[PDB]
Amino acid sequence: QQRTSSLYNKTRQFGITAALIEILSAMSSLEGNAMKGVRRNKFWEG
Amino acid sequence: PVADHKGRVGHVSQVIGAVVDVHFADGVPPVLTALDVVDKLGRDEPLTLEIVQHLDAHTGRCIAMQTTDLLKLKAKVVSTGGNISVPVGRETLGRIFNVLGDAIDQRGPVGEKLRMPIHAVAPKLADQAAEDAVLTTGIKVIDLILPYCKGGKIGLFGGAGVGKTVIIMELINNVAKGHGGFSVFAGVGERTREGTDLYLEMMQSKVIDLKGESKCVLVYGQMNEPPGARARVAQSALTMAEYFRDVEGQDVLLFIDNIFRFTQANSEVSALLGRIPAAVGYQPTLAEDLGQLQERITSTTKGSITSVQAVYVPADDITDPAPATTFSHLDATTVLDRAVAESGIYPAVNPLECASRIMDPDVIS
Amino acid sequence: VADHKGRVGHVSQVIGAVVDVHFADGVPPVLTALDVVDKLGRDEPLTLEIVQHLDAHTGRCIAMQTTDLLKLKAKVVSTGGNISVPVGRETLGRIFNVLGDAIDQRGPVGEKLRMPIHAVAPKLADQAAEDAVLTTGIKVIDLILPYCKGGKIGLFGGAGVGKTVIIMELINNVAKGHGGFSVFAGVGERTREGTDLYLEMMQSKVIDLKGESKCVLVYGQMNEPPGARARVAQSALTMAEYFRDVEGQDVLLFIDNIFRFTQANSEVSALLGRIPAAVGYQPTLAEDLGQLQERITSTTKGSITSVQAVYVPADDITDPAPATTFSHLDATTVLDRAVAESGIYPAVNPLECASRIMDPDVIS
Amino acid sequence: FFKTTEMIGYVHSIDGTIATLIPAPGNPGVAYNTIIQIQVSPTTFAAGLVFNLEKDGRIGIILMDNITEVQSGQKVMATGQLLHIPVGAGVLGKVVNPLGHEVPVGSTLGKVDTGAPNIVSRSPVNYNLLTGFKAVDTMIPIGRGQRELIVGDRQTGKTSIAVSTIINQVRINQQILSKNAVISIYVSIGQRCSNVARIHRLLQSYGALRYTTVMAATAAEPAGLQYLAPYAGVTMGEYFMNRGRHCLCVYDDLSKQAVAYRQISLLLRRPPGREAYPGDVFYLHSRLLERAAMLSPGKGGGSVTALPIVETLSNDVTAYIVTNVISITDGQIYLDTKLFTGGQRPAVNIGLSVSRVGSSAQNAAMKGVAGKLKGILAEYRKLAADSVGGQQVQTIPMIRGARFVALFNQKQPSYFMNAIVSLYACLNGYLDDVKVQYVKFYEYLLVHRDLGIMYGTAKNKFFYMYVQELNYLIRFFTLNSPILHGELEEMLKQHTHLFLQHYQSKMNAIKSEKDVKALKNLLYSCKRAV
Amino acid sequence: FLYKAAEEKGNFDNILSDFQKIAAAASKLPIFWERTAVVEKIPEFKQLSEPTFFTLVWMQNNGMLELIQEVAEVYETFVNAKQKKAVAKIFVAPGGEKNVEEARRVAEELHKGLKELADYTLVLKTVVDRTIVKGFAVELAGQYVNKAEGQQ
Amino acid sequence: AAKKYDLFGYEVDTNTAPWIEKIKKCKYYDEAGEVLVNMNVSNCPPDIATYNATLQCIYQSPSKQSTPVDNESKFCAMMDLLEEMQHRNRLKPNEESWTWVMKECVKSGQFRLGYCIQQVMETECKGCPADLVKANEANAQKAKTEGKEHPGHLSQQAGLFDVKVE
Numbered sequence A: 001q002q003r004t005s006s007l008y009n010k011t012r013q014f015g016i017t018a019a020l021i022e023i024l025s026a027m028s029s030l031e032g033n034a035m036k037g038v039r040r041n042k043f044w045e046g
Numbered sequence B: 001p002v003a004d005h006k007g008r009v010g011h012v013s014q015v016i017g018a019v020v021d022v023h024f025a026d027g028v029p030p031v032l033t034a035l036d037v038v039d040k041l042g043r044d045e046p047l048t049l050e051i052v053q054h055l056d057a058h059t060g061r062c063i064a065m066q067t068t069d070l071l072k073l074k075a076k077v078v079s080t081g082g083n084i085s086v087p088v089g090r091e092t093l094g095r096i097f098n099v100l101g102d103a104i105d106q107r108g109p110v111g112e113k114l115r116m117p118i119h120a121v122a123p124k125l126a127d128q129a130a131e132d133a134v135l136t137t138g139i140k141v142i143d144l145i146l147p148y149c150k151g152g153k154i155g156l157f158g159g160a161g162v163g164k165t166v167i168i169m170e171l172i173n174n175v176a177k178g179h180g181g182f183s184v185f186a187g188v189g190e191r192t193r194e195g196t197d198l199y200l201e202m203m204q205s206k207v208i209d210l211k212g213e214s215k216c217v218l219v220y221g222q223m224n225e226p227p228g229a230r231a232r233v234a235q236s237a238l239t240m241a242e243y244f245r246d247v248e249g250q251d252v253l254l255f256i257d258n259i260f261r262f263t264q265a266n267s268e269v270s271a272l273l274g275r276i277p278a279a280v281g282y283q284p285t286l287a288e289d290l291g292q293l294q295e296r297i298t299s300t301t302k303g304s305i306t307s308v309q310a311v312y313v314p315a316d317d318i319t320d321p322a323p324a325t326t327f328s329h330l331d332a333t334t335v336l337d338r339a340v341a342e343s344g345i346y347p348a349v350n351p352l353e354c355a356s357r358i359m360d361p362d363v364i365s
Numbered sequence C: 001v002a003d004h005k006g007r008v009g010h011v012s013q014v015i016g017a018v019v020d021v022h023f024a025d026g027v028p029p030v031l032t033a034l035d036v037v038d039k040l041g042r043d044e045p046l047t048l049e050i051v052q053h054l055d056a057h058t059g060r061c062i063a064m065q066t067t068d069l070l071k072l073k074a075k076v077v078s079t080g081g082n083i084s085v086p087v088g089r090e091t092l093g094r095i096f097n098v099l100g101d102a103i104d105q106r107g108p109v110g111e112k113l114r115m116p117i118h119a120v121a122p123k124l125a126d127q128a129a130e131d132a133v134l135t136t137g138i139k140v141i142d143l144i145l146p147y148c149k150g151g152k153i154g155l156f157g158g159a160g161v162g163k164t165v166i167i168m169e170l171i172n173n174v175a176k177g178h179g180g181f182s183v184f185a186g187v188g189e190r191t192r193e194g195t196d197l198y199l200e201m202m203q204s205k206v207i208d209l210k211g212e213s214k215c216v217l218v219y220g221q222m223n224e225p226p227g228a229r230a231r232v233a234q235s236a237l238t239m240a241e242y243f244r245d246v247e248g249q250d251v252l253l254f255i256d257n258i259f260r261f262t263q264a265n266s267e268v269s270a271l272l273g274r275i276p277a278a279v280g281y282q283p284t285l286a287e288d289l290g291q292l293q294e295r296i297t298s299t300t301k302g303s304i305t306s307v308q309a310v311y312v313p314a315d316d317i318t319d320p321a322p323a324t325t326f327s328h329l330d331a332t333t334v335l336d337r338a339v340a341e342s343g344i345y346p347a348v349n350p351l352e353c354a355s356r357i358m359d360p361d362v363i364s
Numbered sequence D: 001f002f003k004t005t006e007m008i009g010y011v012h013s014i015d016g017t018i019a020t021l022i023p024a025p026g027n028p029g030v031a032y033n034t035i036i037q038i039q040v041s042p043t044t045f046a047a048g049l050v051f052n053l054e055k056d057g058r059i060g061i062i063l064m065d066n067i068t069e070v071q072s073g074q075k076v077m078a079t080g081q082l083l084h085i086p087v088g089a090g091v092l093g094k095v096v097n098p099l100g101h102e103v104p105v106g107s108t109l110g111k112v113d114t115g116a117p118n119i120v121s122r123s124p125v126n127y128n129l130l131t132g133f134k135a136v137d138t139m140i141p142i143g144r145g146q147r148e149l150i151v152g153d154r155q156t157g158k159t160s161i162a163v164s165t166i167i168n169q170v171r172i173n174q175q176i177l178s179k180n181a182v183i184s185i186y187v188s189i190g191q192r193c194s195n196v197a198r199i200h201r202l203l204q205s206y207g208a209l210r211y212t213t214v215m216a217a218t219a220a221e222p223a224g225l226q227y228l229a230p231y232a233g234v235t236m237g238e239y240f241m242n243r244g245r246h247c248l249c250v251y252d253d254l255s256k257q258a259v260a261y262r263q264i265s266l267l268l269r270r271p272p273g274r275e276a277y278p279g280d281v282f283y284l285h286s287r288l289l290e291r292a293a294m295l296s297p298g299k300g301g302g303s304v305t306a307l308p309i310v311e312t313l314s315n316d317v318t319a320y321i322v323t324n325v326i327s328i329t330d331g332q333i334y335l336d337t338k339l340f341t342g343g344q345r346p347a348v349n350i351g352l353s354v355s356r357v358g359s360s361a362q363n364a365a366m367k368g369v370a371g372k373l374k375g376i377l378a379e380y381r382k383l384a385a386d387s388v389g390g391q392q393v394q395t396i397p398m399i400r401g402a403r404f405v406a407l408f409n410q411k412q413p414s415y416f417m418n419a420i421v422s423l424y425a426c427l428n429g430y431l432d433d434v435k436v437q438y439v440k441f442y443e444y445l446l447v448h449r450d451l452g453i454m455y456g457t458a459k460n461k462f463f464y465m466y467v468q469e470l471n472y473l474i475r476f477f478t479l480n481s482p483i484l485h486g487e488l489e490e491m492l493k494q495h496t497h498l499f500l501q502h503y504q505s506k507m508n509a510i511k512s513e514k515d516v517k518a519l520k521n522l523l524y525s526c527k528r529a530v
Numbered sequence E: 001f002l003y004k005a006a007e008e009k010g011n012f013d014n015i016l017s018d019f020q021k022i023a024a025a026a027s028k029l030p031i032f033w034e035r036t037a038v039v040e041k042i043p044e045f046k047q048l049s050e051p052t053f054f055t056l057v058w059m060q061n062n063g064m065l066e067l068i069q070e071v072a073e074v075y076e077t078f079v080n081a082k083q084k085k086a087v088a089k090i091f092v093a094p095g096g097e098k099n100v101e102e103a104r105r106v107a108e109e110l111h112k113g114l115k116e117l118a119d120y121t122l123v124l125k126t127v128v129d130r131t132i133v134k135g136f137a138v139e140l141a142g143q144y145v146n147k148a149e150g151q152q
Numbered sequence F: 001a002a003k004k005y006d007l008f009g010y011e012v013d014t015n016t017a018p019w020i021e022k023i024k025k026c027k028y029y030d031e032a033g034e035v036l037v038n039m040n041v042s043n044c045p046p047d048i049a050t051y052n053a054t055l056q057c058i059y060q061s062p063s064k065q066s067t068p069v070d071n072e073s074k075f076c077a078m079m080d081l082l083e084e085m086q087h088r089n090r091l092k093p094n095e096e097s098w099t100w101v102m103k104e105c106v107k108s109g110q111f112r113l114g115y116c117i118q119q120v121m122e123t124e125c126k127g128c129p130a131d132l133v134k135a136n137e138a139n140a141q142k143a144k145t146e147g148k149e150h151p152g153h154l155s156q157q158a159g160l161f162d163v164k165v166e
């Protein structure tokens, strides 16, 4: 019973972490595919 | 009346999978609007799109009821003047349709005197009917533990290899043949072979009488079809049933197999539309998206609808958000167990997990 | 720009409790406190705490109250420093919030001084030169799990075991013996329980309205936002540090709980957008807990013992928050309902109890 | 003198039930968490709530109605005020939306978002609140100003518990003054309009609509509406609470509210967390529930009782929302599917159910009875734990515990007088010779009817069951008092002797194919009657 | 940037003329020109003012060529504020702006009510609103008056 | 004469004469309950005299409201008020309240409740009024003579299978 409880705790922790990682990866994709901003540089400086 | 946006012209701007962006100089059409691609593109079939979002006053984002093959940028698209419409009436009896409502049985033109949009507002609270009448399915466990209610909602929750489709066919044979009201079947995201077998069985049973008068209609959007069709086919069939309920005043049967494919299809496109995944990978709007359809599926004062929906539980994990949400939008639930199926018991039904609303002495004996 | 007091800024972005502020003269330093001077028909004052700098003029801040009825370009005034809290014996027998404002409606504090919330922890040279023992006056605690001055005591146990009784007895014994006041900090705790605790303290006279009061109270309730729930503990610790240094005493800082503080910091990190670490706790968990615990130590001037109530989610001590809390804890105190049912008070399980100064090196 | 409305900008993007707004150049601007109207038509408007304010000037809006009528480029106006909803005695017996609109069926304004009372404005919880269920009233005390969770699984009677609790107060409200009457506010979220209609019909049949109101946010409604409903309900309760009256706010259920908030946040691109629920979920629930309190005597003496409902999937109580709500609330009532199927309806699991408030919320007589009942049940559980695989020994604690368990079964709420009388009889052992399967019939005969009058053996004067007004006398004076103790004991002795002499003897003597079936039907009818 | 450049010379109407030229050029240009357009190679824009051409080149380099309309609107707002002109938007049914006397008098009343605009001079700008079939609406400094009716 | 401090030590207003006058001037005792609520809001806690005035208003009032209310009972209302006074305010009822209760019981004709109140008065107060006791006895004897001593379905004889359990 003690071993099963330890495995259960480990599994819940891993599941939570994996779900968070997946969601964060999706958010990173979406945001980084739109991160932008005007650049104040010399475009004429060719 | 005529919508001001009918005939409005737009150009394709961005294409990603089943998601396409359309820019209209005059102005983006209304949400849920239906558009058709005019350019030939060498496609063997026409290309149809449905709008689901607006990115600006002139730009919109749409999904495709069909494949996006041979699609270029700047492609010309024209509004249809309204949402996707499907034929309604007794003229559709004993006929097979798709998401777009075009006959696919190769059995000749269909005489349509009225087309109704797929999207409709759900009945309000006051338009509900209080009917408590048991239904006899000819099955001991179902009639005993979780009796069904006429005009009510039934779910068959199960995994794979448990007998949801078999039970649906058995109920069809037991009831729909003798039921005075008509029937509507929704083959959503399932096996075309099973659909064909069901059609043959109906023809044998004379439910679909080509020479005479039929009693059932079929709408088939299967796994081969893209997610847009797999999502809107159920709503099209529901519109048919709503017409039969309101404009006629019948007690219509509505079988669906399987609803889970609707949510799966919406999740397939959530991220592309630009919506973050929520849980298990399902789209955040799952609750509202399923609730709208479930509420539209209900009995009203005019007519009555008895709905039976098959529900797929991934990995036999009932805790999945889609089944969890579906549980609350039903009157009766029949849960299937793989262990019971393995033990040779068929139908594999777990009465402990089964439930029913009409299991009160006031309604039943 | 050394003295930024009175600096004016305009609100530029609002999302939830996160507010962006633009200053023409340059953003103030980190942890600075700002106040919304504009009249927005708000029933309560609005104050913000700076946590990040987006650019030279733009700074990100977290609100200690709801951001309702807040418009863009609203005026904001700096307070000239970190959040300030009153100190002294005037606070005795009084209830405070994070902002150092009394909510007991029992007249002005009359404080003679105010101190910042965020203060660096005592240096190595300022640490106590010898390990000591705290005489609680209770046989079990002082025998089996003796406490160490400047240490941390992790208290495990819910209701029905007289946790409040033990706390009040500890405060009374400390005052009767070592002669040091007490500071209680309710972080993310039930308002009903806080009210009951205040009433019991007034009944016991540890907090006497008409007489001497041995305890100060600071309450950031669950209704309060995460920023306040986090900073209330730092305010109480600031008061305790003032007592330790200025008055050279042996103070007791009771915290209920520390898990709520950790949860509030995690919520703050999520709002700021930092990607959560394992389970979902903020990556800065250890640093945040250290910046509080290290401030609790025995100095050459005085001592600040701490008694922190711990809640273990899922009954898993393996969880990162309780694990990190234990890494800082010095001693443990367990309460079991079976002991109370049998009829032994205080209900303590000495077998499960433990301490680190249970060595002849310090004790006899 | 025209009807001027501040225009702020146009609609830029539409994503489901939310939207984004672009302000017109040089405009006054709008505040946070305020209400706006989208001019779909020159005479029609759609309601929206502000939720984000970007640096660029764009705004995030949550729609509430007429979503299908919304299109990009439409005009927008701002009310400039928070959300205020109608409140007063003119709302009772009605179904209303969170926005205050009345839903067709076949006094002042109150803010939805208001701060909770401070420390000094509260008082200890003493006044009892009766759900009509013996198990709840004895083992899990509920006091006004308390926040007691109802955690269960699908199809366990969670909503039925709250409905019966509301109904049980109708008789009390009819009898006692309106000052101490309880006003009920039932909130339905993400549920079926059909279920809402059934609940309304049940309340109308039982006459509870007079003191009850319903706040509906049924599915097919926007997530913003579902997310706003509970705060509107709490405001409606606070209206009475600040006016020295007692309210009971029922939520069904917070799970769908959390889902809606998650959906809104993810659509609006806010940082998520565990299970994708943002970090503000705990604060949301805390500020929703802390508004329930027992106000101090100087503040009016009013109270608000919270009975939120939560569903756990396969007994997964470790979920984020369930953990948060359990930690927030002042105790929980746990429903068990095992017991529900086994027949214990309600299926309360005492071990998993607790009331942090304690016995201070019980009445004096109920307090005294529970003081012994709790220990008796504990002993019975301890013995049953060892009795799994061995013959039982019929001791007094086991017998009394079994009889109490049988009594706890019930369908409708039980009046305080009958409940306390039956519990006292079982505690003092007048049922020790009664059969477990016949306890329900015994109680039915004792409560609904009488045997002393029927058999001409009446000797008491004032202690008779049919005098329902003795409930307040019992509340004032404990049963263990010389005033009523003798009469109660005499009546119980007479009833027990008559039952054992006449009815139980016949029951044991039944030997037939039809008499047994009739007895079974009678027993079940009594069980689900009392 | 455009406002500062125009202020350096004291002339602003040239910017609006350049914006009108740009609108005409965009109308003449093919679909989705801005996606791959080069302002230098575009012949029409070669006749624009130096500040306008510089801003167009900057937006081309950043890829933000779709903001010309909003930039022009903001520049016009700045010019109107500098010149002390308050523009009122008259939303009229699609087709027919003859019925503008009522809108003008309503705008005058609103201007009188708005004491902050006393220095500024009232101007009118007509815009077609497909939503309304009859009547008109008036907006001024955020103050919106509805006097129009839609389809039933 | 002497200040009274609340739970938190704040004083309260002991001047309740205007509220007593309002209660006496009320018509329906629900209005008196509203007056008590207003007193609680205004921090003027009711006293024994106020509760007795409320009981008198209940006794002398026509009904609970202008419109009839099902299953209304002056006795139940007064008992609830007494419970609130004794338990949630720590105030012992005086003989005046019990006399009012007995008068209400006699007026209603509830002889059993009259007997119970008589016993309570004998136990706590210094006996029950002879006039009220005699009136209660006369009402009981009248009911006995007329045949309304006890309900009818209770007297009705029912066997094991005859009880019509609904």
Ligand SMILES: Nc1ncnc2c1ncn2[C@@H]1O[C@H](COP(=O)(O)OP(=O)(O)OP(=O)(O)O)[C@@H](O)[C@H]1O
Binding pocket: B328, B356, B357, B359, B360, D152, D153, D154, D155, D156, D157, D158, D159, D160, D161, D345, D346, D410, D411, D412
């Ligand atoms: N005390 C009871 N005794 C017997 N049956 C009961 C009792 N309480 C509820 N029921 C029955 O249990 C069934 C489910 O009730 P209810 O809808 O309240 O449960 P639930 O847990 O809220 O389920 P759901 O998820 O559908 O809301 C109904 O048929 C109801 O009549």
Ligand SMILES: Nc1ncnc2c1ncn2[C@@H]1O[C@H](COP(=O)(O)OP(=O)(O)O)[C@@H](O)[C@H]1O
Binding pocket: B158, B159, B160, B161, B162, B163, B164, B165, B166, B167, B346, B347
């Ligand atoms: N009534 C039945 N008797 C015996 N086996 C059955 C019965 N119904 C289903 N099955 C078993 O299950 C299979 C059909 O499962 P099905 O309902 O089609 O699955 P799914 O729900 O995944 O579509 C059959 O091939 C058979 O093995």
Ligand SMILES: [Mg+2]
Binding pocket: B164, B165, B190, B257
């Ligand atoms: Mg199948």
Ligand SMILES: [Mg+2]
Binding pocket: D157, D158, D159, D160, D252
């Ligand atoms: Mg329910």
